[PDB]
Symmetry: C2
């Protein structure tokens, strides 16, 4: 019903689920409670809840509030379950990218490491933090599936979810695998970074949540097609925006420290275009960027690389692509009959995702 009120509903569904696990986790033991509490806080103090939002929009675009005989609570739990996949993805991503900060706060492995300092116990706290976090992510992923399966959605509705759900989870992990193979090979092709955006972000963040929601409502293939097309375009633009924010955005907007993508050495489309341009502009600048990415750590060294990147003209090219993709994404909403209210919310979601931060 509302873009700003929906995340609170998501938090309620999640709190309910986490509470329901407490006795089983307790029966295993108090240290598992301590581990799950770190997952609980990471999940409950979440981001914008963009993925459940899109699932809910997809449900409403397919006219679920009028036609669907699924229980409301069941649909909301299915939408909210995506936050557990997100938890898995982010916790594991942060180990892989070895980041210290997520959402303005310490990453789960960093936070578990700081619990081992207060205990003064046996073993390396850094490896222990990583260890607990691998398992915390596994638990989150297992709980995503449970939250969907035990939602109370009918057997018919659950069977309809398969295409979106099967698609999404392979696509996100596949995209994350492609990402780190680009980081290891120091890759500079735009087209391979494009594939990462398509699978690791677009499918997972926008296209498949919409598909999932529409499928729960029993949406027609024509409705689903338009939503998937919207999700592809807006989803890629969303990632391109986050790439720009990961370099040029204030820490208050991103959660991370300024230019953390340079620290991590992420192989964005921005970087690929920047290196491509700097090879034809200033060999000294290209070399400066190449030596910097994935190595430098001081604020001053990040800023120098960043200004070299900006001086290529790459940022403007990314901005143009964002604008083009936002425009074509929005246009797909006019290809089918969608209720006025939902179309308006889908438009504002897109604009907020790609342009308005």
């Amino acid at each position: 019903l509302d873009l700003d009120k929906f995340p609170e509903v998501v938090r309620d569904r999640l709190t309910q689920f986490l509470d329901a696990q407490e006795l089983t986790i307790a029966d295993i033991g108090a240290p598992v409670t301590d581990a799950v509490a770190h997952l609980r806080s990471f999940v409950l103090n979440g981001g914008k809840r963009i993925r459940p939002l899109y699932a809910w929009a997809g449900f409403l675009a397919a006219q679920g509030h009028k036609n669907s005989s699924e229980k409301l609570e069941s649909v909301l739990d299915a939408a909210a379950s995506l936050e557990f996949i997100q938890a898995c993805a982010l916790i594991h991503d942060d180990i892989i990218d070895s980041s210290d900060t997520r959402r303005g706060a310490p990453t789960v492995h960093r936070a578990v490491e700081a619990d081992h300092r207060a205990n003064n116990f046996e073993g390396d706290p850094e490896h222990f933090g990583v260890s607990v976090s691998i398992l915390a992510g596994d638990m989150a992923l297992v709980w995503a599936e449970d939250m969907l399966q035990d939602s109370g959605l009918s057997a018919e509705a659950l069977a309809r979810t398969r295409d979106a759900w099967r698609g999404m989870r392979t696509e996100v992990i596949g995209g994350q695998l492609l990402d780190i193979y680009l980081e290891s090979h120091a890759n500079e092709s735009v087209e391979l970074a494009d594939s990462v955006n398509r699978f690791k972000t677009a499918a997972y963040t926008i296209a498949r949540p919409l598909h999932l929601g529409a499928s729960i409502a029993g949406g027609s293939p024509q409705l689903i097609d338009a939503l998937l097309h919207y999700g592809h375009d807006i989803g890629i633009a969303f990632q391109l925006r986050d790439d720009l924010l990961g370099v040029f955005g204030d820490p208050a907007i991103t959660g991370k420290p300024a230019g953390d993508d340079i620290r991590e050495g992420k192989r964005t489309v921005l970087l690929a275009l920047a290196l491509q341009r700097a090879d034809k502009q200033s060999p000294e600048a290209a070399t400066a960027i190449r030596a910097g990415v994935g190595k430098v750590t001081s604020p001053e060294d990040i800023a120098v690389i960043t200004e070299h990147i900006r001086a290529t003209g790459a940022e403007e090219e990314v901005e143009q692509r964002i604008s083009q993709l936002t425009e074509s994404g929005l246009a797909h909403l006019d290809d089918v009959d969608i209720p006025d209210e939902v179309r308006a919310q889908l438009r504002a979601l897109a604009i907020r995702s790609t342009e308005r931060r």
Copy 2:
């Protein structure tokens, strides 16, 4: 139908599933194919397939071959899906315990690390191996769920699987969390190590596979109870046997190098009893064991710790517990009507699991 022929059927179901993923993985890109190939080999050159075996036995104990109108292929895929959970568990366990060898061959993270030496590319190969393996495990876990959900089991059968399936996956990850919290706190209580055996092994390896199989067949609560009781006892004994093998077993039997549990410093019931005994016997020996576990690496230093452990009398106490649990586990098969052939196979499975290696 057969204990020795069933693992080949499992391999066939798995090969079929993995082949079916190839186009989706290819659409993402060639490096994801390379990553999945490492998971494919790890899964296809598997162990004894004990978990699908027990699921199949549970199905047959509930008289599925006579009464069930589920497709045979669907039941076998559900049984085989447990190998993907195992893959997830083992790949992630090997990162956490930092082991180099699994099943006589290099661990997935060690093998991915050796692929980065042949490429001579950017970044630390050790962290990259761990990185790919975290995601390889995530993919395995996601594929376990898919293989079950898309098995072709009816909506009725899938709804019946929930208790075993929900139970198992929380219990295994929970048990793995409790395990590393015992390793970090250098814990020496028998009762906390018991809980790890109960949840990380018994539930996951024997009790819940049996429950899953019986549930697919629509087994009565009385049949399921007897199988769960058998699974509890035999499952704990199975872990206790593997603890003894992890110290006193030949590498040809275990896959790992001799006494790798001492290298890893695993907090087994054997070690807890050994330290408890050595405190009342020889303070020098207790201290020798305490300084050794999780630290020493040379064959000679492992053997010294091992002989100190054996000299406590702890091994004999574990052997007695194994024998007691095997006897009470087998007895539970007589508490309900189970077909003669299946009861005989359940007996031989138990004996092979706890005594006969």
